[PDB]
Design a protein around this ligand. Sequence first.
Ligand code: CLA
Ligand SMILES: CC(/C=C/C=C(C)/C=C/[C@@]12O[C@]1(C)C[C@@H](O)CC2(C)C)=C\C=C\C=C(C)\C=C\C=C(C)\C=C\[C@@]12O[C@]1(C)C[C@@H](O)CC2(C)C
Ligand SMILES: CC1=C(/C=C/C(C)=C/C=C/C(C)=C/C=C/C=C(C)/C=C/C=C(C)/C=C/C2=C(C)CCCC2(C)C)C(C)(C)CCC1
Lengths: 152, 94, 197, 194
Amino acid sequence: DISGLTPCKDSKQFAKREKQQIKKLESSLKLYAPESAPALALNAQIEKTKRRFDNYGKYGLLCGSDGLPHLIVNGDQRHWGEFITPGILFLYIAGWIGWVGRSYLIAISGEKKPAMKEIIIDVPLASRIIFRGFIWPVAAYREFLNGDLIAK
Amino acid sequence: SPSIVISLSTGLSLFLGRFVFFNFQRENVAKQGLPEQNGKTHFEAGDDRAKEYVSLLKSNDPIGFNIVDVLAWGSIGHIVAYYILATSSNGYDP
Amino acid sequence: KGEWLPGLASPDYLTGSLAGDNGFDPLGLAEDPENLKWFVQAELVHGRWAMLGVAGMLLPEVFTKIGIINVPEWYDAGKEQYFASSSTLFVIEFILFHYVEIRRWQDIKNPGSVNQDPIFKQYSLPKGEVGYPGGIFNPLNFAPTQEAKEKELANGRLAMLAFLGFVVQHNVTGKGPFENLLQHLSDPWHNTIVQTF
Amino acid sequence: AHWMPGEPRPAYLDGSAPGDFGFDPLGLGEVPANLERYKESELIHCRWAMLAVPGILVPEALGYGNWVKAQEWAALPGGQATYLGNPVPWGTLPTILAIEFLAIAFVEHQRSMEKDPEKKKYPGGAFDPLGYSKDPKKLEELKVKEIKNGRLALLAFVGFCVQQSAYPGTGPLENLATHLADPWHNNIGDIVIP
Ligand code: CLA
Ligand SMILES: CC(/C=C/C=C(C)/C=C/[C@@]12O[C@]1(C)C[C@@H](O)CC2(C)C)=C\C=C\C=C(C)\C=C\C=C(C)\C=C\[C@@]12O[C@]1(C)C[C@@H](O)CC2(C)C
Ligand SMILES: CC1=C(/C=C/C(C)=C/C=C/C(C)=C/C=C/C=C(C)/C=C/C=C(C)/C=C/C2=C(C)CCCC2(C)C)C(C)(C)CCC1
């Protein structure tokens, strides 16, 4: 489809790899008794492998010539969830962390010896500050417009 | 006929140099003086081979056309004429 | 005025002068006065839109259920065909909304500056507070008392909640809102959110 | 008379110059010499576009094709130009290009030799035989009218170019006809969203 790739629900190397893995597991399964705990563990492993392959096929990925899925970070609308959808999420969480830390530092800048508050964290003020990062984009944008983000 | 094209291009370039673009070029040359090192020209700083050739550039022309201007404008005209001839030589089309 | 949580002290910057003030700001967004003014205008216009939206997506469904008119649901309105293509309507809306919203933004930035009519110079708007233009926008000339402002703000907040509930409860269950209410009223103990999905 | 009511005017633009409405969001006119050069460039652009727009409108109103096809004859080797349906005997690329270069270069270099900044924008004298510029009372009104019409012509040229880009091989007049064919179907919508 894109860059000479094959849809993952149509390629044959995917099925061949699945068969190889299943046979490799079943070779070890035969050794033990069918009712024994290792048999149950190996059956669970086989079920997990089958579910993973089915999910990968149903999710609309694209295997390559050799048989493995390929990620597309290009920006096509059919792969929103491949890179772009997770990435934004990360930024959100990441921003949270940063924002919170910055706030805490300012919250201890007033006192005469902030080093004691840096090496021994206090829990009440930190817990007050932690949940303010849930709306970090709005506060950050307002501070940028006001001009309090950058020192002078 | 290469001779007609060459002569026409050379004459047009010479006319453009002598009667149209002369004042602008002269003013621009006068604005940018001789190259200077440490606030002094090359001849002043102690270079003897960098002396300007005042004798050659003097001319009896009413406005001041000299040999160097003739050579430069003729070279431009010849370049243009030969480009025209070479382009007309083949039959390439886009 | 009142308290949104007994046993909690209200923030200092919220002094109860603003309409509909209950001292609810746990995350402390409105610390700077400029942010407070911007968010006040936002809470006005955001919500003045939502009340109309909620009424428009709810009342036709009730009227259709009781049977006077046959109208598509609020979801399937976009899929229906109209007299003109959606693109031209979108362009017309974009241009008109650009004009009106730039006028409103200019008024907010510089109060009492865009009251004069650009075309007919004689007409103008009487001076007032930002966010409540009055004048020609008030044909019946109702009294702009504080109680009316508080009622409007409360109705707007309820509209916010109603719209969010409508959208999410359609997302989880494809059935419409009024039909969802009727299904719940059929048997409350077996048709709540917990019992079904 | 500001471009946007409720917005402060810039310092360097007070309204003395004709067709001045205090529009400079990017602050490009801080340097007075830059402001004068910008005024010159704007006036020249306006005059050229004003002279050009009828040159597009009158053709394609007769049987002749459009402002784009009239340019395709130079692409074909050994082509010859035409005028009013009649082929010009001297129509070929080298001679036409050389004549254009010589004439335009001489005219422009003659123009650039003027020194007074005011005389560059409005030369006067021999350029106006009728003599509308003798009376100073109407001069400001005429200048404002010229500036406004030139800006309108520039917008017209932008519209022409963008419409041509959207529909290759299409003239403005047939575009207007197509728009009038069904006003509620042929609009900017189908190109702004696919
Ligand atoms: C507390 C929050 C914090 C914040 C907001 C920043 C901010 C920044 N860092 Mg700094 N940094 C931090 C902590 C922080 N740092 C720590 C702890 C270290 C030592 C490991 C560094 C070492 C560091 C380096 C070596 C560099 C930066 C650079 C940068 C800048 C670019 C972003 C980036 O590259 O991140 C880089 C981030 C890291 C390598 C790791 C940060 C992850 C920490 C552990 C998270 C903060 C957690 C903290 C313990 C929370 C406590 C609060 C709680 C008590 C409430 C940006 C201004 C880069 C630069 O200079 O850009 C101009 C760069 O070169 N930082
Ligand atoms: C405007 C709005 C909805 C508008 C809907 C419209 C126009 C709908 C129009 C249509 O339906 C029609 C008519 C007909 C259909 O055919 C088409 C569409 C287009 C579908 C919703 C806003 C919805 C807005 C919502 C839900 C906002 C919620 C905000 C909350 C809860 C904030 C809480 C806090 O901020 C405080 C207050 C203080 C802080 O300290 C703490 C926290 C917690 C951060
Ligand atoms: C005496 C006199 C006169 C006359 C004069 C004349 C006539 C002159 C001429 C002059 C000339 C007539 C000159 C020329 C020059 C030239 C040149 C200077 C050239 C150059 C060239 C080149 C450089 C080339 C190159 C090349 C080559 C080698 C090869 C190929 C390529 C090319 C082309 C690149 C008169 C009457 C007026 C006046 C009086 C006096």
